[PDB]
Amino acid sequence: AKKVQAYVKLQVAAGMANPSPPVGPALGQQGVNIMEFCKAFNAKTDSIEKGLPIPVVITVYADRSFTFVTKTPPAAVLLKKAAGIKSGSGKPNKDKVGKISRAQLQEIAQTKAADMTGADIEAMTRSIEGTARSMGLVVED
Amino acid sequence: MKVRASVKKLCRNCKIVKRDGVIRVICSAEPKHKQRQG
Amino acid sequence: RNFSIIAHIDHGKSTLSDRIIQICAQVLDSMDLERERGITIKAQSVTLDYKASDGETYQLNFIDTPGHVDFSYEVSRSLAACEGALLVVDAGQGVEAQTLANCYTAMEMDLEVVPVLNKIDLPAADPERVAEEIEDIVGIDATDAVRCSAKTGVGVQDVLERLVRDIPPPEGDPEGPLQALIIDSWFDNYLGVVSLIRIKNGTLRKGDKVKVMSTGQTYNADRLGIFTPKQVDRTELKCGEVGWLVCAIKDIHGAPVGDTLTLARNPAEKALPGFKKVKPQVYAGLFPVSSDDYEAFRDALGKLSLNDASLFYEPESSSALGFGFRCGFLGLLHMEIIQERLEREYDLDLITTAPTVVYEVETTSREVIYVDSPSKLPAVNNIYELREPIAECHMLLPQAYLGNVITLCVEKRGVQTNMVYHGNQVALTYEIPMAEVVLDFFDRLKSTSRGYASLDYNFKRFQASDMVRVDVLINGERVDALALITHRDNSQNRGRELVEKMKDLIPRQQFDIAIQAAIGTHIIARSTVKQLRKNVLAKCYGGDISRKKKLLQKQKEGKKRMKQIGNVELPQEAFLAILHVGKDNK
RNA sequence: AGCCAGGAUGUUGGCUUAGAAGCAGCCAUCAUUUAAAGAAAGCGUAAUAGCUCACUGGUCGAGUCGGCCUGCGCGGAAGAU
RNA sequence: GCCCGGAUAGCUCAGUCGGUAGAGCAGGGGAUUGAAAAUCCCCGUGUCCUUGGUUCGAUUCCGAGUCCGGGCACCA
Numbered sequence: 001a002k003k004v005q006a007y008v009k010l011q012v013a014a015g016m017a018n019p020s021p022p023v024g025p026a027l028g029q030q031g032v033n034i035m036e037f038c039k040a041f042n043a044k045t046d047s048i049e050k051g052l053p054i055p056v057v058i059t060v061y062a063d064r065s066f067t068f069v070t071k072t073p074p075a076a077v078l079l080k081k082a083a084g085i086k087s088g089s090g091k092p093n094k095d096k097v098g099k100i101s102r103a104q105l106q107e108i109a110q111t112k113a114a115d116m117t118g119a120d121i122e123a124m125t126r127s128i129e130g131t132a133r134s135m136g137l138v139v140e141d
Numbered sequence: 142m143k144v145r146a147s148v149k150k151l152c153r154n155c156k157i158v159k160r161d162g163v164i165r166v167i168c169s170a171e172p173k174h175k176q177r178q179g
Numbered sequence: 180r181n182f183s184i185i186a187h188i189d190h191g192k193s194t195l196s197d198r199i200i201q202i203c204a205q206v207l208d209s210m211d212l213e214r215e216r217g218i219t220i221k222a223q224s225v226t227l228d229y230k231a232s233d234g235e236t237y238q239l240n241f242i243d244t245p246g247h248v249d250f251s252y253e254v255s256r257s258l259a260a261c262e263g264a265l266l267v268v269d270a271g272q273g274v275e276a277q278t279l280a281n282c283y284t285a286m287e288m289d290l291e292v293v294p295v296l297n298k299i300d301l302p303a304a305d306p307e308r309v310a311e312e313i314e315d316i317v318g319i320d321a322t323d324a325v326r327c328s329a330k331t332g333v334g335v336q337d338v339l340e341r342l343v344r345d346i347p348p349p350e351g352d353p354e355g356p357l358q359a360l361i362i363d364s365w366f367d368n369y370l371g372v373v374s375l376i377r378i379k380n381g382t383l384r385k386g387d388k389v390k391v392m393s394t395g396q397t398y399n400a401d402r403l404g405i406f407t408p409k410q411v412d413r414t415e416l417k418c419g420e421v422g423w424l425v426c427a428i429k430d431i432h433g434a435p436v437g438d439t440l441t442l443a444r445n446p447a448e449k450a451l452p453g454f455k456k457v458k459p460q461v462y463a464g465l466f467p468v469s470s471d472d473y474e475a476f477r478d479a480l481g482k483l484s485l486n487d488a489s490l491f492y493e494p495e496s497s498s499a500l501g502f503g504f505r506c507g508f509l510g511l512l513h514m515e516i517i518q519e520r521l522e523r524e525y526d527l528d529l530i531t532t533a534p535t536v537v538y539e540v541e542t543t544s545r546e547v548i549y550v551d552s553p554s555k556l557p558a559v560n561n562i563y564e565l566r567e568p569i570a571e572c573h574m575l576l577p578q579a580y581l582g583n584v585i586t587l588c589v590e591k592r593g594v595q596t597n598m599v600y601h602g603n604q605v606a607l608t609y610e611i612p613m614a615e616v617v618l619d620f621f622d623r624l625k626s627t628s629r630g631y632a633s634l635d636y637n638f639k640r641f642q643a644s645d646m647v648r649v650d651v652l653i654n655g656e657r658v659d660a661l662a663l664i665t666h667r668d669n670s671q672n673r674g675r676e677l678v679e680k681m682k683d684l685i686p687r688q689q690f691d692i693a694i695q696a697a698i699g700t701h702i703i704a705r706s707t708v709k710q711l712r713k714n715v716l717a718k719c720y721g722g723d724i725s726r727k728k729k730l731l732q733k734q735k736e737g738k739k740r741m742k743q744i745g746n747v748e749l750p751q752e753a754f755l756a757i758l759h760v761g762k763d764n765k
Numbered sequence: 766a767g768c769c770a771g772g773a774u775g776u777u778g779g780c781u782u783a784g785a786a787g788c789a790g791c792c793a794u795c796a797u798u799u800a801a802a803g804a805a806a807g808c809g810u811a812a813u814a815g816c817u818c819a820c821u822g823g824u825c826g827a828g829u830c831g832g833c834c835u836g837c838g839c840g841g842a843a844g845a846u
Numbered sequence: 847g848c849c850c851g852g853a854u855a856g857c858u859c860a861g862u863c864g865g866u867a868g869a870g871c872a873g874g875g876g877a878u879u880g881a882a883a884a885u886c887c888c889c890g891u892g893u894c895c896u897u898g899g900u901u902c903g904a905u906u907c908c909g910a911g912u913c914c915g916g917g918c919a920c921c922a
């Protein structure tokens with residue numbers, strides 16, 4: 001499972017299963033029934049909030065069979081949403097753009113506690129600041 | 142190979158050697174970096 | 180029996196032919212253009228009475244074929260005329276790019292193939308290696324295809340034996356309505372239009388009333404017969420056999436190729452399915468060197484084109500050459516040649532030039548007009564939205580070369596509309612400006628992809644851009660002849676380059692000169708010719724300086740006058756090199 | 766110094782670009798897993814993947830390192846009977 | 847290549863210590879004529895040569911560039 005015969009990590013929109021500029025060609029362009037995947041990845045989608053990126057490393061086999069294994073939505077995106085911005089720093093990063101509550105961030109680790117191996121949950125949020133600080137915005141934490 | 146008077150290294154792979162009286166840079170990495178005389 | 184030989188450029192493919200003729204390079208070839216270069220160029224249908232090992236006398240409607248990217252449409256046709264397809268391959272040179280391309284056309288045609296290891300005499304040859312290299316590629320069986328030389332040979336079997344047992348008999352019923360297919364029809368003076376043809380139904384006796392279909396024309400059957408290695412008449416062509424059909428065709432376009440023909444005694448519905456469509460890859464425009472020539476040169480294509488469909492041309496105009504034609508060549512050899520088939524025949528001297536392309540335009544008003552040439556644009560204040568034509572593309576290449584091809588299209592201004600897929604062989608798509616395409620874009624695909632490529636074009640949709648004129652000044656004398664249209668970022672290079680041709684071919688003048696490409700009044704580039712000047716000082720040598728500034732002061736004060744009267748005749752320069760034709764044959 | 770290993774997570778950092786995934790550019794460069802690992806020192810890719818150095822373990826068992834001030838030398842250094 | 851001054855509407859040009867830019871002409875309209883010139887009147891229709899930076903703010907200031915004029919040096 002964890003070891004792949006030829007895996008393909010790839011960020012992908014929640015709202016689609018068969019685009020092309022995003023994915024299809026992207027899959028290593030190597031043996032994938034896109035007709036399957038479109039019934040595949042979109043099936044998960046109803047549970048998830050739509051229009052947004054989701055990491056989902058894929059696991060190809062010489063069998064041509066595979067088990068795509070969706071993770072959880074990226075931390076870097078969820079900050080911007082509460083921030084309400086449609087993009088990044090826009091202005092150079094050293095100067096601020098966004099804003100965040102101290103209660104914000106704190107559940108962000110809980111949203112992604114799986115990927116986040118951080119022991120203390122409060123400690124886990126320290127990492128979240130990097131997601132925040134690269135945006136350069138001043139969290140009200 | 143460039144002659145030049147001030148040889149010195151370029152690539153990290155560059156070597157510097159003193160065959161005869163002459164000095165010589167030697168980068169097995171990039172061929173362009175060969176140099177005599179310095 | 181029929182078939183038609185197919186292979187990679189230079190592989191005995193025309194060598195094996197006459198050798199086959201000998202059984203019953205040199206020969207087949209006729210024009211001196213073939214004897215030189217040695218490349219095959221016009222396929223020569225042939226026929227012979229082969230004696231089968233089993234005592235049968237199979238008849239062989241043999242057809243040699245050209246092998247080049249530029250001759251693809253000569254090849255696509257001849258396959259139509261025959262069920263068969265011998266596929267010669269080198270023991271050494273391995274599979275071609277074209278040797279693959281010729282097959283994939285054959286695949287959709289569902290035609291039979293009979294692979295053969297030519298040049299097996301080769302010391303370096305690895306004939307055991309070769310058959311392996313088709314199974315994983317051509318997809319055709321070659322597990323045990325017959326080997327043979329071509330030098331002589333061997334002389335094995337010759338493979339006509341294996342050929343006939345793999346070649347279906349022609350399928351069509353005599354007594355039914357006539358359905359000859361036209362093929363490479365080729366005009367002649369005295370005989371009128373000649374028409375090579377592939378009889379499909381019924382048969383064709385002399386003096387009978389044939390009827391061209393789409394034209395609706397009907398004609399007498401004055402002469403006919405299969406073509407041996409030399410000419411031979413016959414009282415009638417049997418069903419399923421090739422041969423010329425001389426008739427009082429007279430007309431330039433009385434029997435266009437691929438139209439069905441039928442006896443007027445009994446018209447059908449009907450078929451046969453028609454050729455074919457083709458598109459230009461290279462796409463340069465030709466101009467007669469002298470305007471007086473244009474008449475005969477206008478009709479030189481009225482005769483040459485019929486001998487060569489792979490051509491496309493329409494009337495076009497230039498600032499410095501009058502009417503000319505915007506040619507649509509299949510490739511650089513196609514252009515190379517026809518470059519000689521005209522001059523070396525009609526003696527119509529010519530000048531190639533980089534292709535013109537049309538531009539839709541909307542004035543400051545609210546209407547459209549198309550701009551064939553740079554000189555005729557509305558004054559820039561008058562313009563509202565100049566718009567670049569775009570061209571659709573359909574490259575079909577293996578993934579190993581994909582990193583090379585995308586890199587090319589992006590420089591050309593591309594937008595990867597699609598990228599999927601077909602197994603292994605990727606199926607890319609792009610929308611690219613035609614101006615960046617018609618100029619040798621086809622070539623780099625045949626270079627970067629190592630010959631494994633494909634293309635398709637069309638007029639598509641116009642698009643606005645930051646594109647602008649780039650006038651060429653000469654001492655402030657703007658020259659309409661050298662006007663250009665380019666995307667602005669491109670302009671600085673086309674800008675600082677166009678002057679560089681001028682600098683090397685404007686003769687030194689008695690006053691200092693100022694070539695300078697510029698947009699509007701703004702000047703994006705400059706070069707200058709140098710003054711000529713008398714030595715003046717060559718005399719004084721007492722060494723006092725004030726006695727020497729007096730002379731040099733006149734040299735300066737007077738050039739200031741000669742500079743203002745100026746004026747510069749510019750004869751044929753507004754032409755050569757400046758219009759590409761700086762290389763031979765020119 | 767050499768030889769055997771690891772070289773990870775947040776995460777494609779932010780934008781900007783069709784693409785910007787350690788690496789086309791601009792601002793930033795914290796945080797967790799720890800023996801240890803830069804949001805990256807090169808190679809690499811169309812874009813990813815891919816390969817290394819940096820830092821750590823292992824064997825290894827004797828000095829290693831980079832500057833300073835001075836003596837003398839080496840390249841720089843081609844001409845006409 | 848140096849020195850000095852420049853690059854502002856379709857064309858010829860005025861201006862800037864760092865404070866939301868103009869003139870004649872061309873073009874497009876109005877008035878006048880039975881309408882036509884002519885004449886008077888009215889609208890700028892620009893990213894201040896292009897590209898990055900500093901400033902609350904840049905047409906000015908700074909960096910890099912492509913250019914124009916004049917003055918030296920090169921220029922049978």
Ligand SMILES: Nc1nc2c(ncn2[C@@H]2O[C@H](COP(=O)(O)OP(=O)(O)NP(=O)(O)O)[C@@H](O)[C@H]2O)c(=O)[nH]1
Nearest residue numbers: 188189190191192193194204218219246298329330
């Ligand atoms: N020594 C040797 N030469 C051979 C052999 N087979 C072919 N050739 C040579 O290789 C060349 C190829 O012959 P040719 O018939 O022109 O091949 P082609 O593919 O028909 N040429 P084209 O594609 O231009 O028509 C000729 O010079 C021919 O003499 C062979 O077995 N041995």
Ligand SMILES: [Mg+2]
Nearest residue numbers: 192193204219
């Ligand atoms: Mg040949």
